[PDB]
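Students often ask why inverse folding is considered easier than folding. One informal answer: many sequences map to the same fold, so there is more than one right answer. In these notes we will look at a single instance of the problem. The structure comes first.
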């Protein structure tokens, strides 16, 4: 259903289809699937969205400094993680 990263206004994130999540005690073996691609802790799927940590029930990003959290399989509808 969503593959790749739609264009987005400055300071905003496009739609994020969060379709899969793998958690292991081993940190480097965690993964999330965002917009049809698999990512790891440390990766930046979109500028400057960084995957900070993959937890069991959520993933903790930073976006332009500020933390930004999605629960496991929780999509982002698009926008600034800010209002809503």
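Output (designed amino acids):
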């Amino acid at each position: 259903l969503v593959t790749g990263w739609q264009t987005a206004k400055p300071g905003e994130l496009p739609y994020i289809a969060f379709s899969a999540h793998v958690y292991t005690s081993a940190p480097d073996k965690r993964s999330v699937t965002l917009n049809g691609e698999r990512y790891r802790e440390g990766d930046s799927p979109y500028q400057g969205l960084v995957i900070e940590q993959i937890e069991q029930d959520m993933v903790i990003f930073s976006f332009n400094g500020e933390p930004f959290i999605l629960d496991s399989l929780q999509d982002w509808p698009g926008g600034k993680p800010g209002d809503d």
